């Protein structure tokens, strides 16, 4: 399966300028476009080599589009902040997702559009691509406007036709970049707190897709209460990483194994702590 | 590709 997401952050930055607007776009975890409203240019600067190929018309109309989106956010940062009656001159964000999944064969699967005001939820789209789950007494007003004017209809047309066809095009273009799985190299060691108790840590390094599960198999069961784990860490260079840890008495460490499962990993791996 | 049309305001 594959997806294509468009995150559209818009911080209201009042008084000291003009609403910032970063409009990242993603494909399956990797970024290929960007747009800061304060940078070198006012362009969809490319962010991945396989989109350089597109050519001047593409960048022109993509820039026109994303500046239209930026305009839309700077319009509705004065309506969300108007019904959530919210005190002119205070920072207050808007966030917007899009998407369209496909099958491994390239057939459309699901379409999702999700909006968020200050950190919480707002209107979102169903999985039948036909109605709107307002998540507040403001997203009520939004969904009424979107059920009227059939924004759902236009959006579904976009999603299936345009979003799916360009997604397949991108995966054609990036076929040497996106259709890859990075099997996490596994590494792990212990930090002795004292001569009676210690910690163990299990390292997931270099895996592209941001989905992976680390489990410490404590002698047949996962010691889920003693799982200190960190979030997914962007390794800066497109890959990812994460670790989880547990507190262990000395000697007992031989009763724990780290079990991990990733798309790049056919057989889930066992980490047996080398006593030395 | 970003949504082509000017979308409805939120």
């Amino acid at each position, epitope marked *: 399966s594959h997806s294509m997401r468009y995150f559209f952050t818009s911080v209201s930055r009042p008084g000291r300028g003009e609403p910032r607007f970063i409009a990242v776009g993603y494909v399956d975890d990797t970024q290929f476009v960007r747009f800061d409203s304060d940078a070198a240019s006012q362009r969809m600067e490319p962010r991945a080599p396989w989109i350089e190929q597109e050519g001047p018309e593409y960048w022109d109309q993509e820039t026109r589009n994303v500046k239209a989106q930026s305009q839309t956010d*700077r319009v509705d940062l*004065g309506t969300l902040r108007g019904y959530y009656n919210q005190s002119e001159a205070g920072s207050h964000t808007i966030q917007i997702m899009y998407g369209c999944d496909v099958g491994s064969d390239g057939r459309f699967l699901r379409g999702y559009r999700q909006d968020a005001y200050d950190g919480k939820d707002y209107i979102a789209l169903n999985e039948d691509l036909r109605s709107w789950t307002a998540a507040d007494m403001a997203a009520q007003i939004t969904k009424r406007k979107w059920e009227a004017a059939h924004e759902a209809e236009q959006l579904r047309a976009y999603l299936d036709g345009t979003c799916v066809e360009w997604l397949r095009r991108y995966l054609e273009n990036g076929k040497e970049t996106l259709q890859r799985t990075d099997p996490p190299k596994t590494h792990m060691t212990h930090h002795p707190i004292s001569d009676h108790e210690a910690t163990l840590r299990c390292w997931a390094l270099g895996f592209y897709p941001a989905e992976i599960t680390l489990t410490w198999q404590r002698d047949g069961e996962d010691q889920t209460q003693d799982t200190e784990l960190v979030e997914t860490r962007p390794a800066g260079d497109g890959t990812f990483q994460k670790w989880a840890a547990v507190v262990v008495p000395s000697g007992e460490e031989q009763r724990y194994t780290c079990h991990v499962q990733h798309e790049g990993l056919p057989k889930p791996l066992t980490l047996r702590w080398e006593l030395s | 590709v970003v949504v082509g049309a000017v979308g409805v305001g939120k």
Partner: antibody
Amino acid sequence: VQLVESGGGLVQPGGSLRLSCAASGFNLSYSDIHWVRQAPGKGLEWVAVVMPDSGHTNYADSVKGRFTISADTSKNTAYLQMNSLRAEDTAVYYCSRATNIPVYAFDYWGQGTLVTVSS
Amino acid sequence: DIQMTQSPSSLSASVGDRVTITCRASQDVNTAVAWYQQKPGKAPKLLIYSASFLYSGVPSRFSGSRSGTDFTLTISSLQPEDFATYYCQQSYYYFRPITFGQGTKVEIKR
């Protein structure tokens, strides 16, 4: 989200009074009536900037006292009041009764009136 | 401040006479202004809206164009049944129209 108008060709407000317009079609209820006003060859955005809902119904008022916040998204999206019978009582008040997207037709309006220069 | 200057043009639409109208500002836009016919003596009307995305009324024969830099912002008028005082209205920081232009003129040339 494309709509219609209302309001009437009001007659002499020589006693301070009120005026109203009213929507149709879809309910905007979030971004809606605007009451832009004009004189013969100008145009001004007085009280009742986004009024129905989304609050602060004077985004860019720059006038107060007699131009009055009156109504909201009851499907009849404002009823503005003058409180004036001699000074600046001559415009043709309007209603941007389609304001719904940054870029779709803003089916403004067709009417809004005055007293006269005379009284 | 914000000053919308109307850089007009006029006098000629007989049946097909192409006309270009431009407007100037004292602020800087991204890719847009608003446009607004005003038929003589009645009925204000949306027209072309912005730049980088025009959106047109049912008289969909005009072109409103981007300037990037605010040299001006421009419109193209062609036929003679569309004779109205056109206005240049404010975009980039979305003020729901706050500052109008001042007025141009277009007529059929008999």
